[PDB]
Design a protein around this nucleic acid. Structure first.
Ligand SMILES: [Mg+2]
Ligand SMILES: [Mg+2]
Ligand SMILES: [Mg+2]
Ligand SMILES: [Mg+2]
Ligand SMILES: [Mg+2]
Ligand SMILES: [Mg+2]
Ligand SMILES: [Mg+2]
Ligand SMILES: [Mg+2]
Ligand SMILES: [Mg+2]
Ligand SMILES: [Mg+2]
Lengths: 117, 63, 143
RNA sequence: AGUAUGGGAGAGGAUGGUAGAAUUCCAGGUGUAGCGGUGAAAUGCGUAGAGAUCUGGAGGAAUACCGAUGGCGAAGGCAGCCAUCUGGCCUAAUACUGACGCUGAGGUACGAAAGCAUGGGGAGCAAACAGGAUUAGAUACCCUGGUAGUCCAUGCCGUAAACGAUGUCUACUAGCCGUUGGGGCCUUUGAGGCUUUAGUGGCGCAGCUAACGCGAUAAGUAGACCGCCUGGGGAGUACGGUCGCAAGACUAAAACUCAAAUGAAUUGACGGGGGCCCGCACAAGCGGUGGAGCAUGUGGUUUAAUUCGAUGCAACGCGAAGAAC
């Protein structure tokens, strides 16, 4: 029902999974997909292919709202961060800009202990 | 980074430039550093080793 | 091998039609060194197809092998582009394997049948080609 | 050796305030199936709506980048920014006192982390503990939660591989190359080049050392004072005493037992160390064994006897190139 011309894309890339959520400006959600949810439920969730599939499905779902130009914000490490923008370009969104938003604490909270494996 | 894209900029080249900007910024290494807490004694030893390697590199270059 | 590279084994062309492709397919058909029976089978199939529809046997065989030839593979799993020799080898192997499982009594007429099926577009070799294409698409992102 | 006067650098100490990033939790908006985690999983969270994104609020703790064999402090140790109180150090000249110095048994002050007593605080992390995995077993390593504690005020505790494994102070003994804080001198293209001083690093002559190595920051050449050791265990243990709320700390033996226990370095060998390289070793292919009948050898059973040897690779169509007598 709602029609919006411009929007934002958020890529939460981690070492185990990648979430792609396409929202409008002001952060109201419009669509969301996950590498694990889009099949590939295993150690392959972190592989670039699953991120590409998630981005493709999210873009196809979000096309219903008539979004042609997108801004990309990418958070955190993890394979598949690059694949999301490639999939968005393939599905046809015109990427105005791509930016990184990974948080950096200024020596705040103590991290967990080192694994002995 | 804020890699603004030209009208005719290909997506692949844009992603390459964004990767270069991220590498220059060094955010990824900072994110890696905080994954696990490192003890002060280990950090001091690591910095000592780094300084020792740096001085040897400088002497080798001068030679 | 670890050290050095072995050159390709030259195969003399088929005496009757002067086609290295035909010779290679004939050797694919051969078993236990029975070259005479392999030659009988292949020449008989080519003559049968030529009589059925008037076309140059070499041209028709090349055209059909072009349709049945694959395009991509995955190596242990990352996709890769197949080399020209492996393309032809896989195509011929698929044709002979599908003929082996076909239900007709003999082998020569049963080979001609599969040739016509592949030319039309429906066949076991074409299905295997489509399957490898699907699996390569599924593993596309890697590499 | 000390004093007065001008300048300089600094995470030196104490008290108060303040700023930005991030985690956690709490409300609201969009929105609907997973989220999270591992080598792979599972426990756990989510349709009374999780995770993702946006807005607002609460609270604790630590200060990215600068950052540096950089800096300061007797040692322990000290990191964002601002104010107040305050110790030491460096540096130039002049002017003063006139040996006022070095070390130091007893004694005394300070003294990481953990731990203890009272009161407060508690985001994240996390002994103990609970659950899920791995394993023959798992009281562990891995995963999901999680208490004391980690934080603040006021005291106690006297310990660390509290290490340069190198007590303090003074004088002398080739050179070369960095760097931090000052003094002096010379060029100009506005920043460079020489010296000297107090720190902090890398080589190296002589000399020293069992060797490794040290070498003006000595483990060299000499002086003054102090502490300490006399084979390995028993053992920093018992008894007695002192200190402590307690945990414990400090002082400190004997009986008994052995011929050893040790340091450095040299050849080998080995490493679930690093590497380099080969072979039908893998990979790419063709055809087999493992399933059926039969031939042959072996292990077991059986027999009066089933004669004796060969037993992972490297025994089993092997000695036997040939048991009806
Ligand atoms: Mg973890
Ligand atoms: Mg004294
Ligand atoms: Mg734990
Ligand atoms: Mg205080
Ligand atoms: Mg001691
Ligand atoms: Mg220390
Ligand atoms: Mg000592
Ligand atoms: Mg005692
Ligand atoms: Mg093989
Ligand atoms: Mg043996």
């Amino acid at each position: 029902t709602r029609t919006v011309s411009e929007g934002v894309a958020h890529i939460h890339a981690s070492f185990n999974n990648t979430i792609v959520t396409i929202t409008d400006r002001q952060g109201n959600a419009l669509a969301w997909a996950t590498s694990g949810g889009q099949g590939f439920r295993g150690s392959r969730k972190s592989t670039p292919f699953a991120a590409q599939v998630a981005a493709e499905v999210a873009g196809k779902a979000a096309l219903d709202y008539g979004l042609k130009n997108l801004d990309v914000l990418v958070k955190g490490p993890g394979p598949g961060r690059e694949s999301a923008v490639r999939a968005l370009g393939a599905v046809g969104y015109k990427i105005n800009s791509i930016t990184d938003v990974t948080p950096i604490p200024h020596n705040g909270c103590r991290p967990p202990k080192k694994r002995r494996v | 980074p804020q890699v603004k894209l030209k009208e005719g900029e290909p997506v692949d080249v844009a992603i390459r430039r964004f990767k270069r900007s991220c590498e220059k910024a060094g955010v990824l290494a900072d994110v890696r550093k905080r994954e696990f807490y490192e003890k002060p004694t280990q950090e001091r030893k690591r910095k000592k080793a780094a300084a020792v390697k740096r001085y040897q590199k400088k002497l080798a270059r001068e030679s | 091998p670890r050290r050095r590279v072995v050159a390709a084994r030259e195969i003399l062309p088929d005496p009757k039609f002067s086609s290295q492709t035909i010779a290679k397919f004939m050797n694919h058909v051969m078993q236990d060194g029975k070259k005479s029976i392999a030659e009988s089978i292949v020449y008989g199939a080519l003559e049968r197809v030529q009589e059925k529809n008037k076309v140059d046997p070499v041209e028709f065989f090349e055209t059909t092998l072009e349709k049945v030839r694959p395009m991509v593979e995955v190596k242990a799993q990352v996709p890769m582009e197949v080399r020209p020799s492996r393309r032809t080898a896989l195509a011929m192997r698929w044709l002979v394997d599908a003929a082996a499982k076909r239900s007709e009594k003999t082998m020569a007429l049963r080979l001609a049948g599969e040739l016509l099926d592949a030319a039309e577009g429906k066949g076991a070799a074409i299905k295997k080609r489509e399957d490898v294409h699907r699996m390569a698409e599924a593993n596309k992102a890697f590499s």
